[PDB]
Design a protein around this ligand. Structure first.
Ligand SMILES: [Zn+2]
Ligand SMILES: [Zn+2]
Ligand SMILES: [Zn+2]
Lengths: 115, 44, 153, 258, 66
């Protein structure tokens, strides 16, 4: 009766925005990225890849409610480096790592199949 | 209207204001046939 | 087709003025009570929007020159009451223009053809010009979807 | 440039199983790959059923539910198949769905097993997995009982419904000797060793590693049949990369908007 | 009533294994040996065939209305 549709966990409706950046004024060089229709799958990798950056002073993600589909990633960087640049670099490194992983997986699968 | 008889399972065409009774065996519990309207389920 | 106002009570009948300006004798069961539209708006001869309880003058028709209070309103006729008038206890009817101020989708089976509900079959319980309430055959819910995403089976 | 450089070692590869090891990566990356295995790998499964006749003892939604869980061979077709929502067709077309039909009547005095062999598709590529072991039993019919239905199978992933989950069992583990002490055993001698444990029989745990991090992850991905088990992993890596690419595109739009 | 298509816990196909399980039990297999011979290794899948009650056989004793 009050069952949400199964596509509501991953589909943006009309007028919904995929990612929104809001600079919080508590501390300098900090931003909050609100990503709609995402879950722990992207939040965890983005948080860890930001934690690999020495210029990132804080990297965290959270789901405010499991019944809603929304990820908040708080990124605070050093003053000579922006949180948006940190987020872009983290996504770029994740994409490069996943492409390398996919190519090496294809190579290893061809090695296992051939012998 | 077509009503399937309860025990002999034979279709009976009766009109309105007629008593419910089977033409063949006289059994008087009859069921409606399944509708011809388009029924669709998500396979979930 | 014809409405009226009771102008006199009797033991077994009524005297009722019709919309046309004539008082006829009808019985008690011969009429049914009409849900009064207290909020009807009409146009006079100079496009002033007249209403119930308004003080108006009649400048055309049989009762031209008379002044009364609007009681009941209809398509092109206005029902008035005037305490100076001895006829029908002051009851008379005039034209609205003789005065001066002083769905085909509901019940049809339907298929959502666009959006995230595409392929679902339902029945339109309630429809407007923009959106329609489609009671879905596949779930236990009635969704609200715009009619441009709907095709009729 | 802080990207990992992960390596892959395939230790086992059958028609329903890939056991592999990913080294030199992060725990978050490994877990996100494991989650995409279950929830974000698209396959083809039945999602639209109309039933012209159902005289069986099981009702119509029961039969539709059992039809949705039958896996269909989605190899090399789900990549070139559109989503129904993203398709420009009015109802259904070969660009977004595969049509199945079923028409079984039992006219013999023994029970008729309506199985997945009776599901007939117009696409020769997308067929029930058991039709390519016995067949998946849909319903049993008594004499005089009929099942006649028309289905459409669209593309989707396990985040929407579990019938689009391509995996049976995603075994995932790391640090098999508890060197990182991520779990703390009250009595370590009471605990059995794993398949990947590198300890002798007298030991129960590895010595504690204070500088260690999860750096080697063991997977056993078992396929339900819709995709080959290596195709699940390749499509999972591609799908995670695509999700990150779309997120980077929207992030670039949001950055340039400000 | 009828054997589930999927194991509830993991999603392994157990709907094509009920008749093979009954045939193996008719071949004087123990239930554990029958489950091992069917490839049901996780105990979540083994309880799907072990605990199944085939009520559709009892439902098929009643004559169809048609
Ligand atoms: Zn009869
Ligand atoms: Zn299409
Ligand atoms: Zn299982």
């Amino acid at each position: 009766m009050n069952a949400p549709p199964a596509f509501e966990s991953f589909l943006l409706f009309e007028g919904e925005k995929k990612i929104t950046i809001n600079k919080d004024t508590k501390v300098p060089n900090a931003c909050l990225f609100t990503i709609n229709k995402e879950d722990h799958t992207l939040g965890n990798i983005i948080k860890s890849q930001l934690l690999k950056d020495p210029q990132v002073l804080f990297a965290g993600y959270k789901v405010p409610h499991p019944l809603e589909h929304k990820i908040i990633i708080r990124v605070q960087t050093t003053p000579d480096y922006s949180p948006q640049e940190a987020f872009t670099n983290a996504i770029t490194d994740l994409i490069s790592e996943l492409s390398l992983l996919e190519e090496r997986f294809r190579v290893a699968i061809k090695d296992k199949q051939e012998g | 209207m077509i009503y399937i008889c309860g025990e002999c399972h034979t279709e009976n065409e009766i009109k309105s204001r007629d008593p419910i009774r089977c033409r063949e065996c006289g059994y008087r519990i009859m069921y409606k046939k399944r509708t011809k309207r388009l029924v669709v389920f998500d396979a979930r | 087709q014809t409405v009226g106002v009771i102008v006199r009570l009797e033991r077994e009948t009524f005297q009722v003025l019709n919309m046309y300006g004539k008082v006829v004798t009808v019985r008690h069961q011969a009429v049914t009570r009409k849900k009064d539209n207290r909020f009807a708006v009409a146009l006079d001869s100079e496009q002033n929007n007249i209403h119930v309880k308004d003080i108006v003058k009649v400048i055309d028709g049989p009762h031209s020159g008379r002044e009364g209070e609007i009681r009941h309103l209809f398509r092109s006729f206005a029902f008035l009451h005037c305490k100076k008038l001895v006829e029908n206890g002051g009851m008379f009817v005039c034209k609205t223009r003789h005065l001066v101020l002083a769905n085909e989708l509901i019940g049809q089976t339907v298929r959502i053809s666009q959006g995230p509900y595409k392929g679902y079959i339902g029945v339109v319980k309630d429809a407007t010009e923009s959106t329609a309430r489609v009671e879905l055959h596949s779930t236990c819910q009635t969704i609200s979807v715009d009619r441009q995403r709907l095709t009729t089976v | 440039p802080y990207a990992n450089q992960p390596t892959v070692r395939i230790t086992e590869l059958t028609d329903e199983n890939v056991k592999f090891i990913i080294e030199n990566t992060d725990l978050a990356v490994a877990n996100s790959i494991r989650r995409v295995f279950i929830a974000e790998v698209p396959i083809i499964a039945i999602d639209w059923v109309q039933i012209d006749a159902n005289s069986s003892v099981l009702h119509d939604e029961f039969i539709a539910h059992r039809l949705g869980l039958i896996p269909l061979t989605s190899d090399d077709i789900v990549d070139k198949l559109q989503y129904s929502r993203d398709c420009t067709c009015e109802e259904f077309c070969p660009e977004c769905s595969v049509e199945f039909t079923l028409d079984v009547r039992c006219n013999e005095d023994q029970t008729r097993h309506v199985t997945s062999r009776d599901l007939i598709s117009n696409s020769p590529r997308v067929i029930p997995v058991t039709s390519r072991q016995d067949d998946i039993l849909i319903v049993k019919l008594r004499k005089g009982q009929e099942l006649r239905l028309r289905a459409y199978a669209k593309k989707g992933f396990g985040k929407e419904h579990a019938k689009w989950n391509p995996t049976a069992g995603v075994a995932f583990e790391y640090d098999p000797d508890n060197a990182l002490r991520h779990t703390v055993y009250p009595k370590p001698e009471e605990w059995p060793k794993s398949e990947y444990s590198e300890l002798d029989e007298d030991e129960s745990q590895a010595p504690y590693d204070p500088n260690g991090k999860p750096e080697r992850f063991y997977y056993n991905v078992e396929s339900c049949g819709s995709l080959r088990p290596e195709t699940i992993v390749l499509s999972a890596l591609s799908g995670l990369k695509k999700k990150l690419s779309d997120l980077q595109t929207q992030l670039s739009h949001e950055i340039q908007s400000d | 009533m009828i054997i589930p298509v999927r194991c509830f816990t993991c999603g392994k196909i157990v709907g094509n294994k009920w008749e093979a399980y009954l045939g193996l039990l008719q071949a004087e297999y123990t239930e554990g040996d029958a489950l091992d011979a069917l490839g049901l290794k996780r105990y979540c899948c083994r309880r799907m065939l072990l605990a199944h009650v085939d009520l559709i056989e009892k439902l098929l004793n009643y004559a169809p209305l048609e």
